[PDB]
Amino acid sequence: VDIRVDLPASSAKPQPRPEKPVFLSVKADKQLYVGDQPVNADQLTSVLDQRTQANKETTIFFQADKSVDYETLMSVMDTLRKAGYLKVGLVGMEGAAK
Amino acid sequence: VDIRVDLPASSAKPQPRPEKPVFLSVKADKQLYVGDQPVNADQLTSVLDQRTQANKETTIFFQADKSVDYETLMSVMDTLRKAGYLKVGLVGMEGAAK
Numbered sequence: 354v355d356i357r358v359d360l361p362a363s364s365a366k367p368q369p370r371p372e373k374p375v376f377l378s379v380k381a382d383k384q385l386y387v388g389d390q391p392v393n394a395d396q397l398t399s400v401l402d403q404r405t406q407a408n409k410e411t412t413i414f415f416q417a418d419k420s421v422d423y424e425t426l427m428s429v430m431d432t433l434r435k436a437g438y439l440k441v442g443l444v445g446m447e448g449a450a451k
Numbered sequence: 452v453d454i455r456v457d458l459p460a461s462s463a464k465p466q467p468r469p470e471k472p473v474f475l476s477v478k479a480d481k482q483l484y485v486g487d488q489p490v491n492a493d494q495l496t497s498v499l500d501q502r503t504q505a506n507k508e509t510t511i512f513f514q515a516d517k518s519v520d521y522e523t524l525m526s527v528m529d530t531l532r533k534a535g536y537l538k539v540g541l542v543g544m545e546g547a548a549k
Contacts, residue, residue, distance in 0.1 A: 355464035356541035357510050358456045360532040366453035379521075412455050419522035423477075423515045427544050434458040434543075443454035445532075446525050 377415040398436035414442030496534035512540030
């Protein structure tokens with residue numbers, strides 16, 4: 354799949370803090386965390402739906418740890434995509450935690 | 452920085468194969484590769500400009516290896532962003548190589 358990422362230049366945000374902002378995180382132990390909720394990919398879409406109130410065009414800014422692997426991380430976001438989440442969010446260098 | 456990623460549902464592409472598609476890659480050794488050109492982040496934007504012909508709204512689909520770390524990968528894309536590359540591309544599970 355060819356995914357388009359819209360990067361904002363000079364410290365900005367294409368999403369001006371959406372109405373229902375959900376913070377997803379992948380920690381060093383490759384563990385998915387939705388705020389204060391530890392989840393697996395299969396349960397990710399479930400808790401996510403409870404977060405965005407089923408809004409699938411909500412940009413889920415994921416805070417991944419510097420030591421998470423790309424297959425784990427992509428497996429997570431691949432899961433959001435199939436849930437209908439057409440918008441995920443890259444936290445540059447994990448420089449924006451919850 | 453809050454970056455918006457537009458994921459296509461049911462195997463699609465928001466970018467219908469742009470005029471000048473550039474394929475960036477981060478290999479398991481955390482080495483940046485632009486097609487057949489091994490580069491560092493500082494030289495990435497240089498070769499990229501030669502690829503997209505200075506077009507900074509070109510979606511650079513990066514093929515990262517499953518074992519690349521998120522800080523390496525983001526350091527790469529962070530570098531594209533400052534170059535003016537407002538569009539990078541997530542290759543889902545590295546399932547689309549050059």
